[PDB]
Amino acid sequence: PEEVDVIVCGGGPAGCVVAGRLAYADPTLKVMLIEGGANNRDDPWVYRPGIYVRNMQRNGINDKATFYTDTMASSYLRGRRSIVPCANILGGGSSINFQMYTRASASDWDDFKTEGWTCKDLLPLMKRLENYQKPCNNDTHGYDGPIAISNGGQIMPVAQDFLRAAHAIGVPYSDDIQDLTTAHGAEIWAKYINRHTGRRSDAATAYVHSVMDVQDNLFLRCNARVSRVLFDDNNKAVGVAYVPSRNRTHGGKLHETIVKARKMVVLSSGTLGTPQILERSGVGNGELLRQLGIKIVSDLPGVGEQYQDHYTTLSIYRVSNESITTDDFLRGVKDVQRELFTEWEVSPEKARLSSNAIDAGFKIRPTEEELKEMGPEFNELWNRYFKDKPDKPVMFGSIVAGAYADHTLLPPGKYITMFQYLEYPASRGKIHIKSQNPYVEPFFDSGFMNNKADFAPIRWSYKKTREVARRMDAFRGELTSHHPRFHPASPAACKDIDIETAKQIYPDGLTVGIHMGSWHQPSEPYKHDKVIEDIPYTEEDDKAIDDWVADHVETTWHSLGTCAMKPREQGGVVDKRLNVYGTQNLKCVDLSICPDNLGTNTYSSALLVGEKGADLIAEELGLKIKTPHAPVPHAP
Amino acid sequence: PEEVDVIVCGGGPAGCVVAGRLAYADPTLKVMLIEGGANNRDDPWVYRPGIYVRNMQRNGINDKATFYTDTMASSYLRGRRSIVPCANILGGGSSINFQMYTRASASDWDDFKTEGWTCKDLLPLMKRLENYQKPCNNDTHGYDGPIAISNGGQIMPVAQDFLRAAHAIGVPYSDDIQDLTTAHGAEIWAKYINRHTGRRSDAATAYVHSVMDVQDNLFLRCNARVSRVLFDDNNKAVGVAYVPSRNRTHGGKLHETIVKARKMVVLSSGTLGTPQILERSGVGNGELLRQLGIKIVSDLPGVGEQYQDHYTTLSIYRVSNESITTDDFLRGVKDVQRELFTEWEVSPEKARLSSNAIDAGFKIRPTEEELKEMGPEFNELWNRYFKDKPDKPVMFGSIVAGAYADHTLLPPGKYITMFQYLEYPASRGKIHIKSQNPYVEPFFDSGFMNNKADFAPIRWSYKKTREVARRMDAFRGELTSHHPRFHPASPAACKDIDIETAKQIYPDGLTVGIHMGSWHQPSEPYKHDKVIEDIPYTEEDDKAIDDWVADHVETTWHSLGTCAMKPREQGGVVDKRLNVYGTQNLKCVDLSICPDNLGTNTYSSALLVGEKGADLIAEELGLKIKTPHAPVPHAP
Amino acid sequence: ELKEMGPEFNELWNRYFKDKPDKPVMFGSIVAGAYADHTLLPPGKYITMFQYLEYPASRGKIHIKSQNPYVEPFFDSGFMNNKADFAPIRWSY
Ligand SMILES: Cc1cc2nc3c(=O)[nH]c(=O)nc-3n(C[C@H](O)[C@H](O)[C@H](O)COP(=O)(O)OP(=O)(O)OC[C@H]3O[C@@H](n4cnc5c(N)ncnc54)[C@H](O)[C@@H]3O)c2cc1C
Ligand SMILES: Cc1cc2nc3c(=O)[nH]c(=O)nc-3n(C[C@H](O)[C@H](O)[C@H](O)COP(=O)(O)OP(=O)(O)OC[C@H]3O[C@@H](n4cnc5c(N)ncnc54)[C@H](O)[C@@H]3O)c2cc1C
Known part of the structure; x- marks a missing residue:
């Protein structure tokens, strides 16, 4: 009416x-x-x-x-x-x-x-x-x-892989990180x-x-x-x-x-x-x-x-080809899609399609020791906002069984993305109309990162989630193209796909293992028994991560x-x-x-x-x- | 917590x-x-x-x-x-x-x-x-x-084939071998x-x-x-x-x-x-x-x-190509795997995948006659342990409708294996840690067969389970390669796949029926009328089974x-x-x-x-x- | 274009290319595809501008390490150990 x-x-x-x-x-x-x-x-x-x-x-x-x-x-x-x-x-x-x-x-x-x-x-x-x-x-x-x-x-097998790795760097497991009381620990993510x-x-x-x-x-x-x-x-x-x-x-x-x-x-x-x-x-x-x-x-x-928003970074990592991911579903491969659509319609309660494949993650909070390394401008905020608020986390981190990125811009193979976001950023934006006309686009300003305190937490997250990546069973290297511009000689430089994994992608390909160009430093093959040590980072490295953040930080639609x-x-x-x-x-x-x-x-x-x-x-x-x-x- | x-x-x-x-x-x-x-x-x-x-x-x-x-x-x-x-x-x-x-x-x-x-x-x-x-x-x-x-x-058609065969060698049918009471009988296995x-x-x-x-x-x-x-x-x-x-x-x-x-x-x-x-x-x-x-x-x-453990032996037999078995599924034939996964999703109550395909078998116990043919050391264990304990079976025997074995070492075609284990070994082992560390392997010793009484019953089983296989409809041969190293002229020596079954496998293949190498003794093609009599065994044959037991006996994970x-x-x-x-x-x-x-x-x-x-x-x-x-x- | 290329490549030019008019500085060819590990390339179609330096100043060396004919020798490409080589490749890009 x-x-x-x-x-x-x-x-x-x-x-x-x-x-x-x-x-x-x-x-x-x-x-x-x-x-x-x-x-x-x-x-x-x-x-x-x-x-x-x-x-x-x-x-x-x-x-x-x-x-x-x-x-x-x-x-x-x-x-x-x-x-x-x-x-x-x-x-x-x-x-x-x-x-x-x-x-x-x-x-x-x-x-x-x-x-x-x-x-x-x-x-x-x-x-x-x-x-x-x-x-x-x-x-x-x-x-x-x-x-x-x-x-x-x-749930995807990578979920529990992520948890095993989170535990190995001392983020504790919990049955429910959505209990209003938690800001440091990792769950199966509902x-x-x-x-x-x-x-x-x-x-x-x-x-x-x-x-x-x-x-x-x-x-x-x-x-x-x-x-x-x-x-x-x-x-x-x-x-x-x-x-x-x-x-x-x-x-x-x-x-x-x-x-x-x-x-x-x-x-x-x-x-x-x-x-x-x-x-x-x-x-x-x-x-x-x-x-x-x-x-x-x-x-x-x-x-x-x-x-106000949450500020997202997406760190992408190559995984073994026997890993289960959404990559080929997202690529539009026609019998991969025909299969999952069919599965969903026949048995929804078990279907891969009855998920978002974002099946694990953590809320995290920095130690005393870690806080020293983060900024003065962040340390100010710490004391102001977080110090005596033990139930507030600084960063988010989840694992997507698949790359959340334009596959038209990603090499072939499988991936996981470490989906990260800053929980309480200091930066602020605004939005105003440009006309009475309801069809004309407004004025808008994200305001992402216009406070300097928002950098050091996200940087700390990149490093942290990467230490999780490196310790996963499925890990077979960082996707160099989409990572920070480290000096190639830096101990913190990326390592892309290993030769064993590459050959499985294109086993009749004429081009796998051609070094000509030196576009990627290959990872060595996966060893079960490997003894792993944290990546050391310098001020130059940190300047790169900082730059990467500026260039690849995004909304979270929050x-x-x-x-x-x-x-x-x-x-x-x-x-x-x-x-x-x-x-x-x-x-x-x-x-x-x-x-x-x-x-x-x-x-x-x-x-x-x-x-x-x-x-x-x-x-x-x-x-x-x-x-x-x-x-x-x-x-x- | x-x-x-x-x-x-x-x-x-x-x-x-x-x-x-x-x-x-x-x-x-x-x-x-x-x-x-x-x-x-x-x-x-x-x-x-x-x-x-x-x-x-x-x-x-x-x-x-x-x-x-x-x-x-x-x-x-x-x-x-x-x-x-x-x-x-x-x-x-x-x-x-x-x-x-x-x-x-x-x-x-x-x-x-x-x-x-x-x-x-x-x-x-x-x-x-x-x-x-x-x-x-x-x-x-x-x-x-x-x-x-x-x-x-x-249930797989070979189930009642096996029972018909067991019956013909004097193991009686029973509705329930798991009634705490039965030691010599054969059932459909749940x-x-x-x-x-x-x-x-x-x-x-x-x-x-x-x-x-x-x-x-x-x-x-x-x-x-x-x-x-x-x-x-x-x-x-x-x-x-x-x-x-x-x-x-x-x-x-x-x-x-x-x-x-x-x-x-x-x-x-x-x-x-x-x-x-x-x-x-x-x-x-x-x-x-x-x-x-x-x-x-x-x-x-x-x-x-x-x-203590149960000591498994795996007797592989070849069967007809019209037999229904798990072999192609176990090999990874995509549209066999796709047909079975799909069938399970739509109607699990009648799916082939709602099974372990170990669909029949028996608990068995030797006669007075048979005991004599076994050792001094097993007759000793017989008196001490089984003689006034008639509800104990000596060996378990079942049919897998498929080859429980690395298919990378199996010729093509269909298989069934006689899965056999020793119900009460005399043989004994031990396990002890080597360190305070929980990540290190412990000192281990199965102990399999370190008691000579344990051979005779297993040898007895091989013979018994062979007589069953030979009396089946599906039977087309013994897999010579995975059987005891009998003397080739010994009446107990293996007969492998017949020519009509072999041609069926590769009907456009250039090599089927080339005698060169004399690697197998072919069976004669299947006769539904064939009168059958037990394989006789000499002392040499028995030694060949003993050695085959020593070579191929495993845990049963019990x-x-x-x-x-x-x-x-x-x-x-x-x-x-x-x-x-x-x-x-x-x-x-x-x-x-x-x-x-x-x-x-x-x-x-x-x-x-x-x-x-x-x-x-x-x-x-x-x-x-x-x-x-x-x-x-x-x-x- | 010679002005863009710096003092250490200009010293080479005067010394080597100036009154030698039949000597080219850079080669360049289209490949009708990627000449690179496709394992590291996105999907789609590609071409590469294949480029090389005709007469480098930079020098390398190779000496054996043992009498044994199966042990790897010492090696040194020596690529770009002379700053004059950077400028013409830059100009090629
Ligand atoms: C892609 C994406 C991913 C996200 N990730 C997550 C996640 O992982 N987990 C999670 O819990 N949440 C997630 N969210 C966040 C969550 O969905 C939002 O916080 C929530 O939907 C916002 O609620 P809202 O009512 O404030 O506004 P909205 O949900 O945005 O709804 C506003 C509605 O108003 C309508 N509208 C706008 N202008 C007009 C107009 N002039 N006239 C009539 N209608 C109008 C729009 O069409 C829209 O439907 C994400 C959001 C998006 C978009
Ligand atoms: C391949 C296979 C085939 C079998 N076949 C059959 C069959 O056909 N029929 C049948 O009825 N039964 C079968 N069984 C036998 C039966 O499953 C076992 O006898 C039974 O499961 C043993 O139960 P358990 O509680 O004693 O220990 P287990 O089942 O062995 O379970 C022990 C658990 O403890 C965990 N664990 C070990 N060390 C540690 C530690 N330091 N800290 C924390 N956790 C630890 C392990 O991860 C494991 O989950 C088989 C078992 C296997 C594996």
Whole structure:
């Protein structure tokens, strides 16, 4: 219809929870979800975990992502314009992400320094979302929420190889590193996949499609880019306008359709999508809205400021050819793909495709001794942020059974990638609209690495994860092309594939073992009995790793902080109930509200923010949340 | 975690019973299971029965096994060094074995000469562990235990061929040779495979993973080598020290983590693993420890003595090309392997891969007539040991529908092997550590055949099993190459493949039937009418079999007796409750404790010992065991 | 182009190539493929500009180490032990 009670704008995790919970809470309450991206209901290119890699392809076909490029070349990235993609589909990140189950640490929530957002406070909500389907030796998880969490159809043999190697450098094993209390140790790494169906646990099918199947009070509009929030004379949100996804209107004319909201408007268009809708509605930096010809509804300079992410490095390593990897699946080899697709359809609960192949990893924290070697500028932060926060980790590290890279730019053979990310970076970016027009790309700045304290931890990670690589059974060398530019004579120089392994790739090849060019220093053949010693590094080596970082550091899609929940004189954007200052009947519930980072893959978090905002809206509307939620399609 | 109540060392079946039963009797009881090898949970190379054969490959890739090699060469095996492998995975033998369901005879347990270990005393515990999923005409088997037993998905046509042949040489058919009573009979042979799911009945999934799914008191540390047991001032067991599987630390330098036990320390690291743990803890031969510089805790010289095993011989026969066998699958013929893997995924309840293809066999016992033909030294052992013990078989004999043998040394075509073993050897061995280091190999000595009584029965078997093969429909010849070196004109000399079978193998080959070299004596082509009479043997022939026994006899992986349960003054190591003499809170519960051999494939034996040890620790801690156990994953 | 190439290659030019007009400095040829270990190359198709220095200044040596005709001798390519050789190859690239 034209009018409804609640409007959710952006169908990410947070938005899907809000829209679903409230609708199920009261069959009368007419509520509508509006999403720029397409509907994801029963799309095999969503519900199948194994194909997740393809969503980040800039190949002119894929449209499940929008790609936001740095407006200016960053000095700090030795000249590059950082790319930060985000989701453009119902379910948002939930429908396209890597599907790693990680939780933030207890202190991360405490450090929101807001009433109702303690660890204490959110633990029941954390439980309310989870359907934990794997063993653990603690009580910290939920067992009847709508979001399935499991170890997937099949862990890869490299997982336990990685663990054996982690142990050999003294990162301890743990049954569950997602227990809110841990910041140093290594686990078998769970996924958002239903143990029994092998399907991706996406927020849309869990919270929204569940309800639409059983009630008539939840309205879904997809392929609907939300332009702006229509305001009152009093700055009460009265409604919203939306346009077609594509700009394929005759003339390229703007075709707005207005939808009205009796009670509440909710913005859930994500860290990058929310502060644009606010801005072109009139809720932003005054000087900016003025320059674009936008009547100010509320002067909030913090709208689209303090853009926070996790900073990813990907260290790639060649592995033996009898190793199990995703490389040939990712390459598009037609009987490798025909096989896994078939396996999934016949036996999902055992299928390789019922996984992300990211089956092991650690949270890590530096020793006293190691801290000396890291920067003054990092040592400052240590004392400030980490020193007496023993439950906060500095780095992440996982092992992907396969290269997460353009295979069009990788030699033949098998690989593993050490997927790394900085947990609480000091650097900060921002995002601002360039026009009222909802189709024009905004201004954007990653801000990756513009604080010098963010280098030394990542550098420490490269070295650390490499010592794990070198001690794995499967290891057969570093991929020299994608590693730091070490001096060739340095004891820290890379060693690429060994001759035995190369010949197996191309056993009729005319070219294997031709030294002519000296493009790679070969590894010696693998010995089981080898006695291994740490790589020594110099200041020159460190300068190389530092440079490599600048050149190859990336987003982790764990974007937050662009509509911060802090006091307004500190530049914040929302209340402890997430209302937008200077307005009535408008909230932001998504990861934009975070005032500080969380040491975790942020799907868990976006869901928990969604759960908290569903409580805040429920008690404001005089409603109560039903447990359990409506049955989730295809679940046993 | 740093401290627990019970610590079980080694995740063999016995260990898995102990760790699982106790954690499930009392959810307060914090129990940790420590396992040298990797976790077997949902490994398709563990749970699919038909790939079991790969686990004994010495190919520098497979690591689900450790290989012990005799320190010295044995005169008795004509100068070779015996190789005894054992399991190196969670579940131990249960994850990698032949999955043959066999039980010992009643007298075997009675002959332990220990109260609480009578057949009578253990029969209820025998039934507790079994889930019997096949028909039989007795009341000897359990029906609600964790470990599922069946005839698998599909019996092979050679099974009833073998029985028809056994019948024709006077071994009678029986519904059940595993009734504790039968010593001379032939059955269809059952497997540790679930009838409904087609999955392997491994101890870990049944006892441990079942529990860990539903409680938080059972802790699992895999890839962790138990070095030594930590002792109190009064020889009480206070904890355990473990190191990583791989010795891949910086500078190969030792790294022990410690874990303390409040109540009990159980050892289940196997016949070969257990004694080693005792000896480097300071429990063993007083002199050996003195020289290795280990402080004595308890002088028990018989730690690592009385190594008993079952002695395997493998008689290979050629069969018709229309026979159905595992040979092409074992060779790696991709579309044979693809047809069988796929069949298992779609319908495990009837798949060829839901089997071990050891689908029939017999326990056998010699006549008065036959005894005379055996030695003086075996007739002596016959009177002393078998004469008034009629429920003990002398030899086990079964048919593998395929060649259990390196196919790299086999001609093309189809095979069946007669898998034979000696049920009670007189011959004896020993194992002792060489260092305080846990990474070093121990001094080892199989002891195979060092007792001359052990030849005659094996020679007797070769003759007997040959007469069966020759009377089969599938039989097309003896594989001369892998048979005893008979004189070529001896009426007992081998006849190999006939010409019609050979032409079938290579119908466009230029070489089939070239006599040049006279490398084989061809069989005459198959006649369904052929009258058959026993091969006669001379003394020279018998010598050729004796030598063939010395050359080709192996372990059956049924290793026992290295921490024996008898009075300490008879060189015993444990109480009638399995307490280590001269210590407090320390028990061996695995097959090490057995004072004598068992006429059985020893997975059943190890489980029972486990069930018994669980009873003994349950009454000592005033716990009560729950029946049924925790529901086993994927079971109906 | 001679100005780009530095003082130690100009001293060679005057000494060796100046009034010797039939002497080339660098050779260059297209190979229709990679001449390199394909084990170290991404997928796709390639060509290589195969380049070599016609008259290097750098010198090497080879002497035996034993009377035995099977032991490896001492060897020294001597490549680039004369800075004059860098500049023309750079110009080739
Ligand atoms: C490729 C990838 C990998 C990731 N890796 C992991 C991982 O390993 N583990 C993990 O747990 N999480 C991972 N995530 C992170 C996680 O998915 C995000 O933190 C989470 O999805 C963000 O939730 P959100 O509600 O704040 O916004 P989003 O999920 O981004 O959803 C915002 C939605 O709003 C819609 N929208 C935007 N603008 C408009 C508009 N104007 N009108 C209408 N609709 C609009 C978008 O189409 C989108 O669907 C990753 C994310 C991505 C993209
Ligand atoms: C290839 C094979 C074929 C067999 N065939 C059959 C058959 O056909 N039928 C049948 O019924 N049975 C069979 N068995 C025999 C049966 O499996 C064994 O007798 C039985 O498993 C022994 O049980 P256990 O508890 O005594 O020790 P094990 O099964 O040997 O298990 C010992 C465990 O302890 C671990 N370990 C060793 N040392 C240490 C240490 N220092 N620290 C920590 N952990 C350690 C090992 O990794 C292993 O997992 C076979 C076994 C194998 C391996």
